[model samples]
Target: SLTLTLKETLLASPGVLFLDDITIEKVESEKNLMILLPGLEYLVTRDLLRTKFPEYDFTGPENVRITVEGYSSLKNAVFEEIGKKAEAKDFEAFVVKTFGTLPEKFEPQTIRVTKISKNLFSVFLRFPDTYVTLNMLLRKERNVVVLKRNINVGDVIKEEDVRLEKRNVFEIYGEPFFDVSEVVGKISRRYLKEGTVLTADMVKDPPDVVKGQVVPAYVTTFVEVLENGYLGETVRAMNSRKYVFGRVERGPVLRILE
Candidate 1:
């Protein structure tokens, strides 16, 4: 039917429609979607309808009124654009980890896209706990620290183990470790291949004292340390009869300061 053809032509997707004929012509800028029929000459005319497709039956009322609804599809567009910027495998893993679901099963939450230029776009993704905004320029690379050699779980990251290099912003997923200082002294949680971009989820601070390890402590005097404690961090300790909290320090020693 003529209505079906017009709907198919005006819609960018199932629930998205172009704001104007000009928007339908644009390959990009698919964000402006409109559903409400305007009173302009663009509507209620067989001649205008035929201008786009001459074969369609354009017979209609002088003021054809139809109520329609639409939604934004820019999020999907930006999601696909970012996917194209990252390696297929890396993107899959990122989506699975960041979203807590398989790439095929994941759906984005609140997202907004701002067009900066033909090659540049800014996207804001909101999370339950926080939000992150990314400024991406297609073909441009961002500086990130990457492992110089393969690292295994529990291995401490050192200055020499990582070096700065240029990488696609989306390829690294959120903002990556940019400096050697950001990575050094951290321990890997899992095996990471060489050239892997360092991320917060990949490494953690090494504990100065591990749980179950007998440690020396000063309870204003001396005591036995219990729970895991990092340097400059406080943990519970037993001073033979009473329990006390002490700050862990070098020598893996716990000292009661307050």
Candidate 2:
């Protein structure tokens, strides 16, 4: 039904009338995969499939599209190159743990490194035959927070609430809470699940409570909570309405200065 070569120096995509001649089957892949100069798809007749014994024919109204899944390419080469530099098993583990797995056909060929540190680097990869200039990072990861169980917002944090966990912090947004004392007695501003890195912003003092919800005698009050005084210390609490002094009784404390 069709006749074509492996690498046609030129090609054409005729519309509407083109389908009148071929079978219509849907082909889906990483891309529609059309290009110029030593092209991809082969040649075929506009309206018919003939038994051209020399060059065969696979009929289609629409060809397979190249819709590539991400991180498919260069994962291999990075593994090969980066492995020799750092802890091979460690680097591989970090990359997998954060970036995720790759497709089997992904034949990574090239890599361009952007070094950030001795052990940390970002590299561009060659995913299969495509060089779309896609880039992602590979580096060391550390465990920061571990939850004993699932916890929800407004819940008072306790020693049994969470623990420490070490993991690859690949592109992790903020700093994690290291000390248990910093976490204990605090209230979670959001729901957190088990086995996760608890960050600084994850939980807050009840005084740092959210709207429709729940600071201190107070420690680090904002500048706006002023008691008609000068903008006080950034580190500690001073004369401020929002940072009112309260009695540390077991029950609801009173704003005594008021």
Candidate 3:
């Protein structure tokens, strides 16, 4: 029988102490080591195995501690390298690389670099809202593009203002010639809304030119007021019921004259 004091028993098996407290006594041998054997008992061993324990060996080098001042200096050096790269390369390549799929239809015409607070560069690109297209007629005529009609504040005008100096009457095809009146009536009655999907019947003729010719016509509708007139609010169109004709432009303005 081995004898073990309450503290000795707990230290021997911590898990056992969770369930209950116990104190063991040995009944056979008088030596402390003999108490470890079966049927040899004593109270416990105070000098039990204290010197023969194992030691932990760390595999790597000892840790080197860094102060707050050293950490801040390292961070500043890293940011300084980044700033130098940005300034040297203009950062355009980086932007294009980042937004590789961006539409290239419009390229940056001009890039402006502004200095913000300390060490910061603000880059901006200038892009035109609208661009000009070369016209063969304008090249042939070598004439200055003039506004045939003085546009009111709100009037919507199209390429007609920039058209060559010539206008013709409405002409129709595909259907019977008699249907020309019906086509004219439809054009007169139809309201040409922005982005209006035009059909053959909506015009007096199959549009004199596929797309950029000027047509001689008159105003058949009364103009109206736009509540939000920032661009041209007071401008209106002719009543669809009137007999009128004009050349259409790519934009909103309608040019009756050259």
Candidate 4:
């Protein structure tokens, strides 16, 4: 325990008058110097053994305590604490990887931290207009497919349409296709923008048989696939010459009646 005069704990603030110098003992090895916020009440507590004196005749309690409650390095301290436990090599990269975008201006309105366990820390940081809460964990990067260019509903996926990219699995919602073959030759089901992470439900197989295509049938006359159909699925077909109806197997040949 070290003893210091009240003059040493002086902090500059707006609209407040700091008073007489009192002697006190430091309870713990914490920083005594602090930058107090304006319009905040400075409460006397056991943690702070320093007190502020107004216009008094040097009449006070035997031991007066004062605790100034704010610090500038709190953000750095919080980042280091959470970074070590989260096992992240780069704090800024980890944040951006977890959330897609980073704040242009890094100003926090408030910060609240709670320790759940030896390895777990729950941190909440509020920015000027938005807030983020994260439960940092002790981590992998996986490869997935992403679109190289924009695609419309009628656009067919080509070999050069996509590329492989590495990303955190936690940030991915559904399973992503890693094989280029799985995505190629498929027609787009929706309008997808460039750099978009390609998913299974976004594309489908192109029609193997177009309407009015002639196909071989088991009967004497040939048949026509009356509607577009994909590979292996059966569709309506007509044997106009024979005046008969039958199911046509979808493919390049589109064989009707087996």
Candidate 5:
């Protein structure tokens, strides 16, 4: 318990006012202070407490309580060093080792891994849905990995800006082109299966375009693009007709041809 006295002499002075039963720990070497109070599991500074509770009158007659806990220099040093080393690695391998497996519905078109830094790489893609520009960084002193994605809301990213590293080996497999399923049209005679590879040459323009009709041209096959993620197999055209290009059902579908 404590009591605060609000005298005119003390109120007029522009100095700090401390209440009783409050323990304040100040380190002369570090120039830091820690305040403690009963029932408070943590510690803070006198200046911080005053800033947080400015409405409370400290000089008035009021009961106050405080508690204090010593600081651990050894533990703080150890944790600080650990954090520094982890940050130096950039957390790259940690992400890949955690979730590198392709998802159930993933259809990769163009995959390029480029080294951005000592332990960082950039991933590039072409398909709108399959396109994901991400940075892979190392963590935990190169023992852990992390994947950093560029999340720009309302920002459109072009496909050409992505840089490719010569030393990094990239495997690009799947269809080289995509068929517009939204338009009403005839599908190619070639039977495509889930995970089937496709090429640009395999696609044929819509019959109306070949016949010189005024109708817009439509894509007939899947073409591999440098994008990340899954592409829908079905599409609809302005004429209210539905068209199927690639594998319609889910699973591991190849979007490019060898």
Candidate 6:
């Protein structure tokens, strides 16, 4: 139980801010000798004490709390309180309005406003543990594949024939192609305009090799896959001789057997 200014209380703790006996474990501030205390009403405040009312301890006992504060490090207590709710609510609405079913367990883990461009604001947000950047968007954010020029219904898409173009969600026919491989070498199904968003609905598989197509190709089908599997490195190559195709990618390892 000590008596000092609110600022002193914060500096004293340099580790946490205690509100009426409740405490927040992480407190970070820079050379400004201060930090943003969340809502209009900061969690930690000052008051003249009578009994155990006020407390301060700047005796210098190494309680400094801090992390690298990397972009991936700032998503705790987002919208946990009212004022913060305003920030979290607004941003979530913006994202949902602009995109898909929020990526999985997508709850706001935490967030922070960290940068500025003379006035332009930038923020960092968290999903599960890692945080992703926000407000720093591309001229388009994953642009969609569109025709470089007019295309006929029967034309096959070529690698250079399509380009990414920024267009509104409604402007696109459906899922916009971000990979040219998804569109290139595919047959067009309709008369598309120069700016048309190329969708799967607009393309089909390369026409069946004609009877006399004479297309050079390696054909492997209904072959074999090891009844069991092999170690990571041996997955594809060792099995290639007996199977059509195989792969060995080092993803999260799963250990189990039948």
What is each predicted model's overall lDDT from 0 to 1?
0.54, 0.43, 0.26, 0.53, 0.29, 0.39
Candidates 1 and 2 compared: the better one by TM-score is: 1
Residues 1-258 of candidate 1: C-alpha lDDT, one tens digit per residue:
333223222212222233233221223335322222111011223443444345545332432222222333433444565555442222211110011211221133666656555444555555454544545434436688988999999899998899899877554554578789988999899999997888988899878887666676664355666777789888887776877778888987788766
Tell me which of candidates 1 and 6 scores higher on TM-score.
1
**lDDT of model 4 at residue 67?**
30
**Residue lDDT tens for model 2, 121-141:** 544445454542322235446
Q: Sort by lDDT, best first: what order?
A: 1, 4, 2, 6, 5, 3
In angstroms, how far off is 51's CA in candidate 2?
37
Number of the top TM-score candidate: 4
**What would you estimate as the lDDT of candidate 2?**
0.43
Q: In model 2, which regions exceed 4 Å deviation?
A: 1-138, 208-258
Q: What is the C-alpha RMSD of each candidate to the true structure, in Å?
A: 17.6, 16.3, 33.8, 18.1, 23.8, 20.7
Candidate 2 positional error at 156, Å: 1.8
lDDT at 68, model 5: 24
The true-structure Cα RMSD of candidate 6 reads 20.7
Q: Residue 24 in model 4: shift from native, Å?
A: 34
Error of 4 at 155 (Å): 1.5
TM-score of each: 0.39, 0.32, 0.13, 0.42, 0.17, 0.32
Residue runs of model 5 more than 4 Å from their true location after superposition: 1-19, 23-40, 43-56, 59-153, 156-243, 248-258
Q: Rank the candidates by TM-score, best first.
A: 4, 1, 6, 2, 5, 3
Q: Against the hidden true structure, what lDDT does model 1 obtain?
A: 0.54
Off by over 4 Å in 4: 1-140, 240-244, 250-258
